[PDB]
Design a protein around this ligand. Structure first.
Ligand SMILES: Nc1ncnc2c1ncn2[C@@H]1O[C@H](COP(=O)(O)OP(=O)(O)OP(=O)(O)OP(=O)(O)OP(=O)(O)OC[C@H]2O[C@@H](n3cnc4c(N)ncnc43)[C@H](O)[C@@H]2O)[C@@H](O)[C@H]1O
Ligand SMILES: [Cl-]
Ligand SMILES: [Cl-]
Ligand SMILES: [Mg+2]
Ligand code: NA
Length: 214
C-alpha cells in the first residue's frame, strides 16, 4: 500500500526540517507546493508566469490555479509513495484533493504560538556590514548593538513582530479549517512539542509503520 500523506505546520514550526528528514529516511517522493511553484516560475511555464504575478504582489495563488498545478504533478507520482507539503493550504484545496485521491495520513506539528513567534522575530542585522545576529543562537555582546562598531542593530520588515503576528494569524485562518476537516475524516495525527529534535523521533516511529525506509 503506497503512502498517501500530507504534512502540516505553521511557519517556524520545524515542518521544513521534519519534511527534509522524512525524505532522507523513507522511500517516498516529497511534493512541496513552494518548490513546484518556484520550478515553474524559473522555467517560465504558463502557470509559472501566472504564479509569479501573484507572488510578486504578496498574494496567495488562487485555489483553482494551485489545485490544477498540484494535481498535474501528482499524476506523475502515482506509482510512488508521496508526501504533500504546503498543499492543501485552504479548505477548498483540501476538498478538491479529496475528490481526486484518497489521503490516508495527515501529520500536524503542534508548536505553541509564542514559540513560533519568538523564532520568527529573532533575527537582527547591522545594516552597513550585513552582520547577522539571532537573539536565540548568536546574540550580540550588548543588547541591540553591533559587536564591532557599537552601532544600532535593526530588524528587516519581514522579521518584525507586527508583520509576524499578521502572518501567523493568516496561516491559522487558512489552515485551522483544514486541520478540522482531516480530524473529522479520522486521518489526523498530531505531534506536540517545542523543540524539533524532540518531536522528530515520534514522527519517525509513526511513519515506520506506514512506508519502507530507504
Ligand atoms: N498551497 C498553496 N496555495 C496557495 N498559495 C501557495 C500555496 N503554496 C505556496 N503558495 C504561495 O507560494 C509561496 C511559496 O512559499 P512557501 O511554500 O510558503 O515557502 P517554503 O520555503 O517552501 O516553506 P518550508 O516548508 O520549506 O519552510 P522553511 O524550512 O523555509 O522554514 P520557515 O519559513 O517556516 O521558518 C523560518 C524561521 O523558523 C525558524 N526555524 C525553522 N525551523 C526551526 C527549527 N527546527 N527549530 C528552531 N527554529 C526553526 C528559523 O530559525 C527561521 O527564523 C507562498 O508564500 C504562497 O504565496
Ligand atoms: Cl518551519
Ligand atoms: Cl537568523
Ligand atoms: Mg522545504
Ligand atoms: Na557571535
Amino acid at each position: 500500500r503506497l503512502l498517501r500523506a500530507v504534512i502540516m505546520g505553521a511557519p517556524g514550526s520545524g515542518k521544513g526540517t521534519v519534511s527534509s528528514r522524512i525524505t532522507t529516511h523513507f522511500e517516498l517522493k516529497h511534493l512541496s507546493s513552494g518548490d513546484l511553484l518556484r520550478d515553474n516560475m524559473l522555467r517560465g511555464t504558463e502557470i509559472g508566469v501566472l504564479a509569479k504575478a501573484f507572488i510578486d504582489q504578496g498574494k496567495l495563488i488562487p485555489d483553482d490555479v494551485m489545485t490544477r498545478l498540484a494535481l498535474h504533478e501528482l499524476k506523475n507520482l502515482t506509482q510512488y509513495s508521496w508526501l504533500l507539503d504546503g498543499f492543501p493550504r485552504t479548505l477548498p484545496q483540501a476538498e478538491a484533493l479529496d475528490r481526486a485521491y484518497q489521503i490516508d495520513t495527515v501529520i500536524n506539528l503542534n508548536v505553541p504560538f509564542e514559540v513560533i513567534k519568538q523564532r520568527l522575530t529573532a533575527r537582527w542585522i547591522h545594516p552597513a556590514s550585513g552582520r547577522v545576529y539571532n537573539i536565540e543562537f548568536n546574540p550580540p555582546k550588548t543588547v541591540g548593538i553591533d559587536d564591532l562598531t557599537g552601532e544600532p542593530l535593526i530588524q528587516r520588515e519581514d522579521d518584525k513582530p507586527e508583520t509576524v503576528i499578521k502572518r501567523l494569524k493568516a496561516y491559522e485562518d487558512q489552515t485551522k479549517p483544514v486541520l478540522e476537516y482531516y480530524q473529522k475524516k479520522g486521518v489526523l495525527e498530531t505531534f506536540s512539542g517545542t523543540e524539533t529534535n524532540k518531536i522528530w523521533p515520534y514522527v519517525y516511529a509513526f511513519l515506520q509503520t506506514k512506508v519502507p525506509q530507504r
